[PDB]
């Protein structure tokens, strides 16, 4: 028996690879002959189909302007998961690449805005992500940010160097260990997409960053925001910020918090 949400496959047309999920290609394509659309399937072998349908229930749940909103999934083999087409790619490539070269802080912390601004509704929501990082969010046109890639996302009831320590370690994933990527975002925001923790393999961020070690400044990136990134990656979950919080702060940073910030020559 299915639900609403249910298309034919024939509804549907494949035009061109847009990347690598997680478990098979993505495509971007029409729906219904009118629609652009994204396309998830799944790989042979890599995982159950039901297990890769989780995925699309989550999304069932969310919607708000700031998540990849679901359209329609076909459930039977081979899976679709038909979502809202995101027209400039993931955030990590974009500010790797030619375009974000000239990227400042003001966009790059409207960015972050609109990221904070789907977490908040995530938090809401009593969900948490799991997932979170540059790599997870899309791009649009006129630089809308998406939160995307909700596969591993789950109702409230792993590398280290995005996730939390006690949700790597004991499994204790809250609202508050996304909060903590979000502060490992803003340093993937501030240095045009690098690694976190450059030079460091797993096992030393894991030993560092439970003796307290945590990443210093970003070159240009003004001590504020550092000390935002600091109150996300508290060692006690519950003493970091909201999203609510960092949805506000980000959003009136350059009123309320450097009012007299200057261009410098990368931020
Ligand atoms: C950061 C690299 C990466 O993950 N790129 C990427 C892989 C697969 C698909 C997409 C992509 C691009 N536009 C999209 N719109 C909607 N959904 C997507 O994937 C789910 C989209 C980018």
Redesign the pocket.
Known sequence: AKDAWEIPRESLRLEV?????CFG????GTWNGTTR??I?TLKPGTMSPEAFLQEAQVMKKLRHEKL?QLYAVVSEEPIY?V????????????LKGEMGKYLRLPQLVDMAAQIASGMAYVERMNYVHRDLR???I???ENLVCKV??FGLARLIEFPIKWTAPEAALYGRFTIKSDVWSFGILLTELTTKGRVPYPGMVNREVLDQVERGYRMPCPPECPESLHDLMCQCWRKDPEERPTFEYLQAFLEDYFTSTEPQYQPGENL
């Open positions: 690879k847009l990347g690598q999920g290609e993505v495509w971007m659309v994204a998830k990849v998961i979502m809202e087409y995101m027209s400039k790619g993931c955030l990590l490539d974009f540059a790599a997870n899309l791009v649009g995307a890639d």
